[PDB]
């Protein structure tokens, strides 16, 4: 069942005495005319404790998991044995409970409804326990939740909170809050400003136009021998590395110094496409720092290589029945390169 | 009652740095509660225990807020916290999903997931244990030796801890300077009819000044009124006529 929290839920925010003044403060409070939850003791569920509860009824236990692992806080004489602390101490008995920045607040009022009542802090406890649920320990009561609302307080000559204003409920309350009084006169008053927010983002670019001619490089009919390896300049074009990356037709795709799948966004001065053919088992020798006949006399990568290496089998194009004798490789030399 | 002079003039502390409150004056002022946090870390990393510093410690282990009000003490302990065979009883967290909020402690030891494949709670490739050992030794360099650190956090309500300064007696209807739990000022101490609630402590003016005080020793409500002041005027005829004056 739902009931409206008409005007109750205000409390003294500090221990500072002010009288016959109007004070504006921002803190956590129970918003006016809020739907409360109703439970009856005619035949104790789990109730979350996200920020605070205005529990008014006409023991207690506050746990987080409640599996005898992260032991909770018990109130009868207060014993909090997570032990970590202990303490010994018609009728509308309203109470307020909240926890903020390692500080536990308890408020009370015992009166024998649309009325005003202010609660003073009792048994405040600065421990710092993590609490997320709420269970009563033992007839109808009510449960509500509080929100970060800005309130305008009224103090009388004796320093008792007798009136309050919810500065975010309705435009009349907004005008009262901005005029710092509980009565206003005729006229138009400025209250706040509105700003329409952006909906979605838009990014645009021109068309792709010319592409880099990877097709003719990779797809050509003839490759030169290793010892006379070719070379090409490629520039002034947009290159899609993703298409060649996600082809799954490449036996070996190793990258050095630069991670794949992110090449798509890095602008470079130049590229180079060195191509040749070597023995299949020997492909592992082409690496930045290896040694061997091929790596020492035919193609040596520097220690600071920055790029990727591609290779695949082509046994069914470059092999002839009579034996291909058009591929050569150096075997002797005076010194490495 | 806390006496900080014995700490300060000890000369056995390598570092004694104070933010917000200066030493040599701690034992004068009163404040609500302290908090002493203690732990042991490597010698080099001491500079990370300070507001606004970033790194492994100040990100995954122990983070101080930006409005810190306290003091930091540290001193080398190379002859207590090291062992011949290497001390592996001191650990520190290395990987975490996101940084820490101030004064928040983490204790769990679940396996970090550093890659795409979920680890399902077993360690392996790209599934690292999140804790590592310092490995202190008596022969390590001074940059790699154990240091003990104690952080004091003050919170500047009825104060309960402060210095050993003695109290004196109160006077009435006399322009004097007072000291109530560190609150200083000048005024005349007159009786007040204000009805403070039992938990009510002070009274504040519009200009954020104290108007009434509740004595700590004997619970009684006094009234503060600023001492007399004003301007002076000199009434003078022309000097060409006389030199007599009358002040106002």
């Amino acid at each position: 069942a739902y009931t409206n929290s008409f005007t109750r839920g205000v409390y003294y925010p500090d221990k500072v005495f002010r009288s016959s003044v109007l004070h504006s403060t921002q803190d956590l409070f129970l918003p006016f005319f809020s739907n409360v939850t109703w439970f009856h003791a005619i035949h104790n569920p789990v109730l979350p404790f996200n920020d605070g509860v205005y529990f008014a009824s006409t023991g207690w236990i506050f746990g987080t998991t409640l599996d005898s692992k992260t032991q909770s806080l018990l109130i009868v004489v207060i014993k909090v044995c997570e032990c970590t602390f202990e303490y010994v101490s018609k009728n509308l008995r309203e109470f307020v409970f909240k926890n903020i920045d390692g500080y536990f607040k308890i408020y009370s009022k015992h009166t024998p409804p649309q009325g005003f009542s202010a609660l003073e802090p009792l048994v405040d406890l600065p421990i710092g326990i993590n609490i997320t649920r709420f269970q009563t320990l033992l007839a109808a009561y009510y449960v509500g939740y509080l929100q970060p609302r800005t309130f305008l307080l009224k103090y009388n000559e004796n320093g008792t909170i007798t009136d309050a204003v919810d500065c975010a409920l309705d435009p009349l309350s907004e005008t009262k809050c901005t005029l710092k009084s509980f009565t206003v006169e005729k006229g138009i008053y400025q209250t706040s400003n509105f700003r329409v927010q952006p909906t979605e983002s838009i990014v645009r670019f021109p068309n792709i136009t010319n592409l880099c001619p990877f097709g003719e490089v990779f797809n050509a009919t003839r490759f030169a021998s290793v010892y006379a390896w070719n070379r090409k300049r490629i520039s002034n074009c947009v290159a899609d590395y993703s298409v060649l990356y996600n082809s799954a037709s490449f036996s070996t795709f190793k990258c050095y110094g630069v991670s794949p799948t992110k090449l798509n966004d890095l602008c470079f001065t130049n590229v180079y496409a060195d191509s040749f053919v070597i023995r299949g088992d020997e492909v592992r020798q082409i690496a930045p720092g290896q040694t061997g006949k091929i790596a020492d006399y035919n193609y040596k990568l520097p220690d600071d290589f920055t790029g990727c290496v591609i290779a695949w089998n082509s046994n069914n194009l470059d092999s002839k029945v009579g034996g291909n004798y058009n591929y050569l490789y150096r075997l002797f030399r005076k010194s490495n390169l | 009652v806390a006496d900080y002079s014995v700490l300060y003039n000890s000369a056995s502390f390598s570092t004694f740095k104070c933010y917000g409150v200066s030493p040599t004056k701690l034992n004068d002022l009163c404040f609500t509660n302290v908090y002493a946090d203690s732990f042991v870390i490597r010698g080099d990393e001491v500079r990370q225990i300070a507001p606004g510093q970033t790194g492994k410690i100040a990100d995954y282990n122990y983070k101080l807020p930006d409005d810190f009000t306290g003091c930091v003490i540290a001193w080398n302990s190379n002859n207590l916290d090291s062992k011949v065979g290497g001390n592996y009883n001191y650990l520190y967290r290395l990987f975490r999903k996101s940084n820490l909020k101030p004064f928040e402690r983490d204790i769990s030891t679940e396996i970090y997931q550093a890659g795409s494949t979920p680890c399902n709670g077993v360690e392996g490739f790209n599934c690292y244990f999140p804790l590592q050992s310092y490995g202190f030794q008596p022969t390590n360099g001074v940059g790699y030796q154990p240091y003990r650190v104690v952080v004091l956090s003050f919170e500047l309500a009825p104060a309960t801890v402060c210095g050993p300064k003695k109290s004196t007696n109160l006077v009435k209807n006399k322009c004097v300077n007072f000291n109530f739990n560190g609150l200083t000022g000048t005024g005349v101490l007159t009786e007040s009819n204000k009805k403070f609630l039992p938990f009510q402590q002070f009274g504040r003016d519009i200009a954020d000044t104290t108007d009434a005080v509740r004595d700590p020793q004997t619970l009684e409500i006094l009234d503060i009124t600023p001492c007399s002041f004003g301007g002076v005027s000199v009434i003078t005829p022309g000097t060409n006529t006389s030199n007599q004056v009358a002040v106002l």
Partner: single-chain antibody
Amino acid sequence: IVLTQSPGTLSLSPGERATLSCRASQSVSSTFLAWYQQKPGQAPRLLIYGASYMATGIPDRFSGSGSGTDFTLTISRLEPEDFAVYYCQQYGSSLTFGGGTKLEIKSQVQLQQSGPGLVKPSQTLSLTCSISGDSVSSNSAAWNWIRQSPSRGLEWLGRTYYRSKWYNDYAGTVKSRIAINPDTSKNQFSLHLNSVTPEDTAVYFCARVISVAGYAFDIWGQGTMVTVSS
């Protein structure tokens, strides 16, 4: 990930400094670089883990630094007994060693190895590494197998360990024909290779790794050689 030993070979005299280098193929986010020193005829020894932290019973001459994709080890004052070889190892998404640098000048836990040293080709190879001073089913440890051949250097074969049940990993080259079995009853773990080839001739070690010590090979074994021949 591939580690490249940057300086090739150095020769110095007693007294002055020495500077090494190690370069990574790409970033090591785990940051578990280590440095080993091996005298001839002996098992390697650990020097540094985490790239900065000293090992057990190591003088202060040794200091390491680096991060990201480069690292370096420095010797402050040479001593004419430090003619040895120095390696460079990492851990993370893959476990790979380094080439190593030649340098020349001018104990509560023990592992014991046993098994045949000669095998008829195309047969089974079996070794055993006994443990004295610890329990093979420890929660915070793992047991590996490392072999060394001059043509291939130092290579990682496989490992086993136990958290709640038993878990195994193996290197890609050797997946199809390798298996490791522990024996808690007599506190030993063994290595089996069903089939052998001539190139497998090498020297094998058994090692221990502690997860809280930077995943560094703390304790090694005596090591034995296996030759594949007629």
